[PDB]
């Protein structure tokens, strides 16, 4: 999830 | 009788004393003091001074920072362009007209400003929707094997354009219409007078359903799923402190995004609903300006939420604003 979250600007 | 009708307009003030004038021809200082028109200009001046730099800066750093130019960021750029349509199509026009005390550009200009102001605000809205869809797709992985790339990003952008046109275009050609609004200095969709020749009633229903309810449902589903997925990942991975943080930060962002969407559109929705349910009651000019205040200010608070509160954009903005360091 982390990489995904970073990609979408949420984390 | 609470208003005064005219070929392309409706002035929420009674003409019993005969002082009402066409909002295209003479000041409207009988429906609000001159100072309130000043305050209206002051307010547009605020939204321009904040809304221009913030949204432009967004485009500018994207030109300067290779890393920002990724497909998932396309829709945020779109968002900033839309906010700019609001700033120049709507806010500047209204700064100008308000200082004259009426809509000096006439019925055709009413259509221009109403179109571009509506286009902008609708591209923005559908941007917030598409961005939620994309996030749902990428994080919740509802489609096995799917990899989000450039082409999907472009389709996401085009989709918003089309949904916005589906909203701003009709009143230019028969279905609803643009007329001056509230204090008569800016123009929007006529969502508050039954005007059968243009079919206001059904258009308002279509707006409510397709451009408010759907958007609201898609956003809740996607971000609801997203929060669920992130809670689950974290519960299955409590040995990871980072993951626990991501779950908190993500939940917080979602609450903020969703509350912000509500603040921006619920008032227009609530008012359009009321008027629809309480046919043609005494709705003053300053009262019709409240939902407008909420929607318009989003050209400032959206970029704060979606752009400034985004780590990458913020770092790049800081670097660009401090001449290249830090
Ligand atoms: C809100 O209410 C006010 C009051 O009713 C309203 O304003 C009035 O509009 C009428 C026209 O619709 C104005 O009429 C003019 O009066 C002057 C003389 O005072 C005339 O010159 C004008 O024309 C006629 O006479 C001509 C002879 O040469 C003919 O050729 C022509 O056919 C006309 O008969 C016309 O009568 C009236 O003066 C104003 N009154 C005020 C107080 O302003 C206003 O329009 C309403 N607002 C809205 C948005 O509906
Ligand atoms: O010199 C071009 C720099 O910008 C690029 O961005 C482009 O990415 C695609 C090109 O492969 C285009 O489809 C897209 O429209 C452009 O935004 C890239 O981000 C940088 O690496 C390049 O230096
Ligand atoms: C930022 C640019 C400033 C806008 C220019 C304002 C021009 C307003 O012009 C004013 O309008 C009055 C109507 O109330 C008229 O009596 C006069 O034409 C004029 O004093
Ligand atoms: C507007 C975009 C929303 C599309 C709705 C698709 C409904 C599918 O609902 C299902 O539930 C979960 C998704 O959260 C997953 O387990 C499934 O893959 C998904 O298809
Ligand atoms: C939310 C669905 C209910 C239908 C009400 C439609 C009213 C939207 O009206 C739009 O709002 C914008 C923000 O002020 C204005 O700038 C536009 O000119 C106007 O067309
Ligand atoms: C679109 C729907 C938004 C989802 C909001 C979820 C609100 C839950 O709130 C979250 O989860 C915990 C509940 O166990 C709370 O105690 C935490 O403060 C918070 O992280
Ligand atoms: C390179 O490092 C240059 C950066 C220095 C700029 C800092 C100046 C602060 C300006 C703050 C904004 C003031 C505008 C208020 C006017 C209404």
């Amino acid at each position: 999830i982390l990489e995904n979250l970073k990609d979408v600007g949420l984390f | 009788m609470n208003g005064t009708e005219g070929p392309n307009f409706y002035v929420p003030f009674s003409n019993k004393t005969g002082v009402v004038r066409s909002p295209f021809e003479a000041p409207q200082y009988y429906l609000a003091e001159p100072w309130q028109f000043s305050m209206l200009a002051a307010y547009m001046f605020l939204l321009i001074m904040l809304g221009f730099p913030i949204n432009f800066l967004t485009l500018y750093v994207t030109v300067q920072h290779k890393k920002l130019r990724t497909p998932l960021n396309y829709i945020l750029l779109n968002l900033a362009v839309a906010d700019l349509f609001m700033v120049f199509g709507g806010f500047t026009t209204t700064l100008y007209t308000s200082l004259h005390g009426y809509f000096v550009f006439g019925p055709t200009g009413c259509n221009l400003e109403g179109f571009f102001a509506t286009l902008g605000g609708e591209i923005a809205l559908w941007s917030l929707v598409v961005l939620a869809i994309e996030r749902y797709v990428v994080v919740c992985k509802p489609m096995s094997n799917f990899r989000f790339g450039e082409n999907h990003a472009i389709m996401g952008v085009a989709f918003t354009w089309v949904m916005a046109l589906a909203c701003a275009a009709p009143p230019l050609v028969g279905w609803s219409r643009y007329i001056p609004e509230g204090m008569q200095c800016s123009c929007g969709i006529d969502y508050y007078t039954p005007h059968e020749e243009t079919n206001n009633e059904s258009f308002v229903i279509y707006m409510f359903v397709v451009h408010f309810i759907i958007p609201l449902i898609v956003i809740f589903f996607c971000y609801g799923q997203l929060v669920f997925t992130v809670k689950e990942a974290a519960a299955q991975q409590q040995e990871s402190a980072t993951t626990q943080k991501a779950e908190k930060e993500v939940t917080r962002m979602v609450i903020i995004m969703v509350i912000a969407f509500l603040i921006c559109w619920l008032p227009y929705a609530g008012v359009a609903f009321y008027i629809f349910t309480h046919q043609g009651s005494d709705f003053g000019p300053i009262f019709m300006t409240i939902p407008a205040f909420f929607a318009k200010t989003s050209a400032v608070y959206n970029p704060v939420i979606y752009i400034m509160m985004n780590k990458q954009f913020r770092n790049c903005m800081v670097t660009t604003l401090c001449c290249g360091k830090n």
Side-chain angles (χ1 to χ4, degrees):
Chain A
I1 29 169
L2 292 184
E3 223 47 32
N4 283 341
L5 292 182
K6 278 149 181 166
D7 287 338
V8 302
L10 282 176
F11 187 64
Chain B
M1 191 158 313
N2 294 306
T4 303
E5 317 182 78
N8 293 309
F9 71 75
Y10 176 81
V11 178
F13 190 87
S14 155
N15 208 4
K16 70 192 175 260
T17 56
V19 301
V20 172
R21 305 282 176 270
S22 157
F24 307 117
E25 306 287 1
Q28 301 284 314
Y29 297 143
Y30 50 81
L31 65 63
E33 311 284 14
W35 73 260
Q36 298 171 314
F37 277 89
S38 284
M39 285 322 288
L40 171 63
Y43 196 72
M44 294 298 108
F45 182 67
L46 195 57
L47 302 187
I48 297 162
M49 290 293 105
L50 296 181
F52 173 72
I54 295 169
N55 290 106
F56 181 72
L57 180 61
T58 296
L59 301 183
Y60 186 84
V61 300
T62 295
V63 173
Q64 308 280 74
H65 297 257
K66 184 208 170 305
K67 282 315 169 74
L68 292 172
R69 300 193 288 272
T70 66
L72 290 156
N73 281 356
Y74 283 13
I75 196 70
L76 295 169
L77 284 208
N78 191 49
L79 169 63
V81 175
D83 289 349
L84 287 170
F85 274 82
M86 298 173 74
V87 176
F88 292 110
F91 304 168
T92 42
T93 306
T94 301
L95 176 48
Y96 186 76
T97 61
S98 70
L99 292 165
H100 290 84
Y102 65 98
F103 189 89
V104 303
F105 298 115
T108 82
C110 184
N111 285 284
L112 283 174
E113 106 99 331
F115 177 77
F116 283 112
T118 300
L119 194 64
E122 282 289 324
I123 291 159
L125 167 55
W126 284 101
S127 285
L128 304 198
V129 160
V130 162
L131 172 71
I133 288 173
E134 289 171 0
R135 291 178 164 169
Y136 161 70
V137 159
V138 171
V139 173
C140 293
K141 283 174 196 288
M143 294 177 283
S144 233
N145 277 4
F146 184 83
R147 205 214 84 80
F148 184 98
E150 199 182 327
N151 287 350
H152 310 98
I154 291 180
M155 275 159 180
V157 169
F159 179 68
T160 63
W161 292 355
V162 163
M163 289 308 81
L165 285 161
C167 175
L172 281 183
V173 295
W175 193 24
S176 204
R177 59 186 180 154
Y178 294 109
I179 58 159
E181 169 209 59
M183 286 162 90
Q184 306 305 286
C185 291
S186 65
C187 283
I189 276 155
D190 181 357
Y191 67 85
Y192 47 85
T193 81
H195 189 263
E196 288 79 347
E197 314 92 294
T198 48
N199 289 118
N200 292 10
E201 191 199 317
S202 68
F203 186 88
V204 186
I205 286 158
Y206 155 77
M207 280 289 288
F208 186 84
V209 170
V210 168
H211 295 275
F212 174 69
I213 296 288
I214 302 299
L216 179 59
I217 281 161
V218 170
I219 289 158
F220 266 80
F221 181 76
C222 295
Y223 282 146
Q225 293 305 347
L226 197 145
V227 167
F228 178 77
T229 293
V230 162
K231 304 279 210 199
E232 163 148 11
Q236 275 301 306
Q237 190 154 8
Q238 308 189 297
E239 75 280 9
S240 166
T242 299
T243 309
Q244 302 314 300
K245 278 175 213 162
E247 176 264 319
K248 303 204 176 231
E249 162 68 353
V250 166
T251 288
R252 201 188 60 104
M253 284 307 300
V254 165
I255 296 187
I256 295 165
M257 294 186 287
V258 154
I259 286 173
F261 179 84
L262 291 184
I263 294 163
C264 171
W265 292 111
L266 198 58
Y268 254 127
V271 162
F273 180 84
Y274 191 92
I275 287 171
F276 194 100
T277 275
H278 290 60
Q279 198 41 200
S281 291
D282 182 325
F283 298 113
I286 289 186
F287 166 97
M288 295 298 280
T289 296
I290 295 179
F293 157 97
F294 283 100
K296 268 160 197 253
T297 308
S298 83
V300 177
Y301 63 75
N302 282 344
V304 166
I305 290 163
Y306 291 90
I307 301 290
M308 283 174 58
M309 284 183 73
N310 167 317
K311 201 164 185 183
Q312 270 215 316
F313 276 99
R314 185 174 64 254
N315 290 332
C316 293
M317 276 168 168
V318 166
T319 298
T320 295
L321 281 176
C322 310
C323 341
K325 335 284 172 189
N326 288 63

